[PDB]
Short mmCIF file of all heavy atoms in Angstrom, two decimals:
data_model
loop_
_atom_site.label_atom_id
_atom_site.label_comp_id
_atom_site.label_asym_id
_atom_site.label_seq_id
_atom_site.Cartn_x
_atom_site.Cartn_y
_atom_site.Cartn_z
N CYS J 298 49.49 -20.55 7.97
CA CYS J 298 48.11 -21.02 7.85
C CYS J 298 47.16 -20.16 8.67
O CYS J 298 46.05 -19.86 8.21
CB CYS J 298 47.99 -22.47 8.29
SG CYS J 298 46.32 -23.14 8.14
N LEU J 302 44.13 -18.13 6.91
CA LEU J 302 42.73 -18.31 7.30
C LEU J 302 42.10 -16.99 7.71
O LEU J 302 41.04 -16.61 7.19
CB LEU J 302 42.63 -19.31 8.44
CG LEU J 302 42.95 -20.76 8.10
CD1 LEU J 302 42.90 -21.64 9.34
CD2 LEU J 302 41.99 -21.23 7.05
N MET J 312 39.29 -19.13 -1.10
CA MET J 312 40.44 -20.01 -1.01
C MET J 312 40.23 -21.25 -1.86
O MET J 312 39.11 -21.57 -2.26
CB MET J 312 40.71 -20.40 0.44
CG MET J 312 41.14 -19.25 1.31
SD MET J 312 41.48 -19.73 3.01
CE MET J 312 39.83 -19.94 3.66
N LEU J 314 41.66 -25.47 -2.08
CA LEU J 314 42.28 -26.53 -1.31
C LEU J 314 43.27 -27.31 -2.16
O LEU J 314 42.92 -27.80 -3.24
CB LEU J 314 41.21 -27.44 -0.72
CG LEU J 314 40.45 -26.72 0.39
CD1 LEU J 314 39.23 -27.48 0.83
CD2 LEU J 314 41.37 -26.51 1.56
N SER J 323 46.25 -35.03 6.13
CA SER J 323 45.81 -33.74 5.61
C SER J 323 44.29 -33.69 5.49
O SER J 323 43.69 -32.64 5.75
CB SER J 323 46.47 -33.46 4.26
OG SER J 323 46.02 -34.37 3.28
N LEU J 324 43.65 -34.80 5.15
CA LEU J 324 42.19 -34.83 5.10
C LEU J 324 41.57 -34.84 6.50
O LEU J 324 40.50 -34.25 6.71
CB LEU J 324 41.71 -36.04 4.30
CG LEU J 324 42.09 -36.04 2.82
CD1 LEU J 324 41.68 -37.35 2.18
CD2 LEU J 324 41.45 -34.87 2.11
N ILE J 325 42.23 -35.50 7.45
CA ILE J 325 41.74 -35.52 8.83
C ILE J 325 41.81 -34.13 9.44
O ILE J 325 40.89 -33.71 10.16
CB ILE J 325 42.53 -36.57 9.64
CG1 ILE J 325 42.29 -37.97 9.09
CG2 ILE J 325 42.12 -36.57 11.09
CD1 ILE J 325 43.21 -39.01 9.65
N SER J 326 42.87 -33.37 9.14
CA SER J 326 42.90 -31.97 9.54
C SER J 326 41.99 -31.10 8.68
O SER J 326 41.53 -30.05 9.14
CB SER J 326 44.33 -31.45 9.48
OG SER J 326 45.16 -32.16 10.39
N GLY J 327 41.71 -31.53 7.45
CA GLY J 327 40.74 -30.83 6.63
C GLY J 327 39.34 -30.92 7.17
O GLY J 327 38.52 -30.05 6.89
N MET J 328 39.04 -31.97 7.94
CA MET J 328 37.76 -32.04 8.66
C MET J 328 37.60 -30.87 9.63
O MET J 328 36.55 -30.22 9.67
CB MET J 328 37.65 -33.36 9.41
CG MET J 328 37.55 -34.58 8.53
SD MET J 328 37.53 -36.14 9.43
CE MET J 328 35.91 -36.09 10.18
N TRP J 329 38.65 -30.56 10.39
CA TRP J 329 38.61 -29.42 11.29
C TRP J 329 38.60 -28.10 10.53
O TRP J 329 37.96 -27.13 10.97
CB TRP J 329 39.79 -29.46 12.25
CG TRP J 329 39.78 -28.35 13.21
CD1 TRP J 329 38.90 -28.16 14.23
CD2 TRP J 329 40.67 -27.23 13.23
NE1 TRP J 329 39.20 -27.00 14.90
CE2 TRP J 329 40.28 -26.41 14.30
CE3 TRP J 329 41.76 -26.85 12.45
CZ2 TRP J 329 40.95 -25.24 14.61
CZ3 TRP J 329 42.42 -25.69 12.76
CH2 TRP J 329 42.01 -24.89 13.83
N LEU J 330 39.29 -28.06 9.39
CA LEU J 330 39.22 -26.88 8.52
C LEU J 330 37.79 -26.65 8.02
O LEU J 330 37.33 -25.50 7.96
CB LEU J 330 40.17 -27.05 7.34
CG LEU J 330 40.22 -25.82 6.45
CD1 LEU J 330 40.78 -24.70 7.25
CD2 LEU J 330 41.07 -26.06 5.27
N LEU J 331 37.08 -27.72 7.68
CA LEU J 331 35.71 -27.57 7.18
C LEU J 331 34.74 -27.23 8.30
O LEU J 331 33.71 -26.61 8.04
CB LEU J 331 35.26 -28.83 6.46
CG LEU J 331 35.98 -29.13 5.14
CD1 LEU J 331 35.53 -30.44 4.55
CD2 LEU J 331 35.81 -28.00 4.17
N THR J 332 35.03 -27.64 9.54
CA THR J 332 34.09 -27.25 10.59
C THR J 332 34.33 -25.84 11.11
O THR J 332 33.38 -25.20 11.57
CB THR J 332 34.09 -28.24 11.76
OG1 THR J 332 32.98 -27.95 12.62
CG2 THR J 332 35.35 -28.19 12.59
N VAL J 333 35.55 -25.31 11.03
CA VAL J 333 35.76 -23.96 11.54
C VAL J 333 35.52 -22.91 10.47
O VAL J 333 34.74 -21.97 10.67
CB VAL J 333 37.17 -23.84 12.15
CG1 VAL J 333 37.45 -22.41 12.55
CG2 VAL J 333 37.26 -24.73 13.36
N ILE J 334 36.16 -23.04 9.32
CA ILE J 334 35.92 -22.10 8.23
C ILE J 334 34.58 -22.42 7.58
O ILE J 334 34.27 -23.61 7.37
CB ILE J 334 37.06 -22.19 7.21
CG1 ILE J 334 38.40 -21.98 7.91
CG2 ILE J 334 36.90 -21.15 6.13
CD1 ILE J 334 38.56 -20.66 8.56
N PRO J 335 33.74 -21.43 7.29
CA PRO J 335 32.51 -21.70 6.54
C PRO J 335 32.81 -22.15 5.12
O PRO J 335 33.82 -21.77 4.53
CB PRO J 335 31.79 -20.34 6.54
CG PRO J 335 32.32 -19.66 7.70
CD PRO J 335 33.75 -20.06 7.81
N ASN J 336 31.91 -22.96 4.57
CA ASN J 336 32.10 -23.48 3.22
C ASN J 336 31.79 -22.45 2.13
O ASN J 336 31.94 -22.78 0.95
CB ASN J 336 31.28 -24.76 3.03
CG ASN J 336 29.78 -24.57 3.23
OD1 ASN J 336 29.28 -23.46 3.43
ND2 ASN J 336 29.05 -25.68 3.16
N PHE J 339 35.67 -21.47 0.56
CA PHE J 339 36.42 -22.25 -0.40
C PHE J 339 35.71 -22.29 -1.74
O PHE J 339 34.47 -22.29 -1.79
CB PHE J 339 36.67 -23.65 0.15
CG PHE J 339 37.54 -23.64 1.36
CD1 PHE J 339 37.00 -23.76 2.62
CD2 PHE J 339 38.90 -23.46 1.23
CE1 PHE J 339 37.81 -23.72 3.74
CE2 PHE J 339 39.71 -23.43 2.34
CZ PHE J 339 39.17 -23.55 3.59
N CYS J 347 37.88 -31.87 -1.91
CA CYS J 347 38.40 -32.28 -0.61
C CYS J 347 37.34 -32.95 0.25
O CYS J 347 37.65 -33.89 1.00
CB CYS J 347 38.98 -31.08 0.14
SG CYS J 347 39.64 -31.48 1.76
N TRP J 391 28.05 -33.70 13.13
CA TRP J 391 29.20 -32.99 12.52
C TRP J 391 28.90 -32.64 11.06
O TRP J 391 29.14 -31.49 10.66
CB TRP J 391 30.47 -33.83 12.65
CG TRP J 391 31.71 -33.15 12.13
CD1 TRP J 391 32.45 -32.20 12.77
CD2 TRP J 391 32.35 -33.37 10.86
NE1 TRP J 391 33.51 -31.81 11.99
CE2 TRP J 391 33.47 -32.52 10.81
CE3 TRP J 391 32.08 -34.20 9.77
CZ2 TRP J 391 34.32 -32.47 9.71
CZ3 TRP J 391 32.93 -34.16 8.68
CH2 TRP J 391 34.03 -33.30 8.65
N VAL J 395 28.57 -28.89 9.24
CA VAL J 395 29.41 -28.37 8.15
C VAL J 395 28.58 -28.09 6.90
O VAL J 395 28.92 -27.20 6.11
CB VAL J 395 30.58 -29.35 7.90
CG1 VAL J 395 31.53 -28.84 6.83
CG2 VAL J 395 31.34 -29.53 9.17
N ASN J 398 27.25 -24.47 8.05
CA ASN J 398 27.97 -23.31 8.57
C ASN J 398 28.27 -22.40 7.38
O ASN J 398 28.81 -22.83 6.36
CB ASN J 398 29.21 -23.65 9.41
CG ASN J 398 30.29 -24.46 8.70
OD1 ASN J 398 30.17 -24.86 7.54
ND2 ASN J 398 31.39 -24.68 9.41
N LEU J 426 33.07 -32.58 16.74
CA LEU J 426 33.96 -33.18 15.75
C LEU J 426 34.83 -34.25 16.37
O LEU J 426 35.06 -35.30 15.76
CB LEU J 426 34.83 -32.10 15.10
CG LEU J 426 35.91 -32.63 14.15
CD1 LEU J 426 35.34 -33.43 12.97
CD2 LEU J 426 36.75 -31.50 13.67
N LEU J 470 41.26 -18.27 17.04
CA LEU J 470 41.10 -17.88 15.64
C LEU J 470 39.86 -17.02 15.45
O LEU J 470 39.91 -15.96 14.81
CB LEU J 470 41.03 -19.14 14.78
CG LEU J 470 41.07 -19.14 13.24
CD1 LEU J 470 41.70 -20.43 12.78
CD2 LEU J 470 39.68 -18.99 12.61
N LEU J 496 45.42 -22.80 -0.45
CA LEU J 496 45.68 -23.28 0.89
C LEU J 496 46.22 -24.70 0.80
O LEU J 496 45.65 -25.55 0.11
CB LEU J 496 44.40 -23.24 1.73
CG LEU J 496 44.41 -23.53 3.23
CD1 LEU J 496 43.35 -22.72 3.90
CD2 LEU J 496 44.13 -24.98 3.48
N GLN J 497 47.33 -24.95 1.49
CA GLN J 497 47.85 -26.29 1.64
C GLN J 497 47.24 -26.90 2.90
O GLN J 497 47.26 -26.27 3.96
CB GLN J 497 49.37 -26.28 1.73
CG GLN J 497 50.08 -25.76 0.50
CD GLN J 497 49.92 -26.66 -0.70
OE1 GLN J 497 49.90 -27.88 -0.57
NE2 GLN J 497 49.81 -26.06 -1.88
N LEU J 498 46.70 -28.11 2.78
CA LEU J 498 46.19 -28.79 3.97
C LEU J 498 47.31 -29.29 4.87
O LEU J 498 47.06 -29.62 6.04
CB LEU J 498 45.28 -29.95 3.58
CG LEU J 498 43.95 -29.54 2.96
CD1 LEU J 498 43.12 -30.75 2.62
CD2 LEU J 498 43.23 -28.68 3.94
N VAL J 501 47.41 -26.83 7.42
CA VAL J 501 46.35 -27.03 8.40
C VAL J 501 46.73 -28.11 9.40
O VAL J 501 46.48 -27.97 10.60
CB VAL J 501 45.02 -27.35 7.69
CG1 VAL J 501 43.93 -27.71 8.68
CG2 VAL J 501 44.58 -26.17 6.90
N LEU J 504 49.07 -26.45 11.75
CA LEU J 504 48.35 -25.61 12.71
C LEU J 504 47.61 -26.44 13.75
O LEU J 504 47.52 -26.04 14.91
CB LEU J 504 47.38 -24.70 11.97
CG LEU J 504 46.57 -23.70 12.80
CD1 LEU J 504 47.50 -22.73 13.49
CD2 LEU J 504 45.57 -22.97 11.94
N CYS J 505 47.09 -27.61 13.36
CA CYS J 505 46.44 -28.51 14.30
C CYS J 505 47.44 -29.08 15.29
O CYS J 505 47.29 -28.92 16.51
CB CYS J 505 45.76 -29.67 13.55
SG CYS J 505 44.31 -29.26 12.58
#
Side-chain angles (χ1 to χ4, degrees):
Chain J
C298 181
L302 291 176
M312 293 181 284
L314 289 170
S323 67
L324 295 174
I325 296 169
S326 298
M328 293 176 71
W329 182 69
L330 184 64
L331 292 176
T332 191
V333 174
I334 306 298
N336 60 5
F339 295 101
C347 179
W391 184 79
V395 183
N398 59 358
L426 174 60
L470 189 150
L496 187 148
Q497 297 293 323
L498 291 181
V501 174
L504 183 62
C505 290

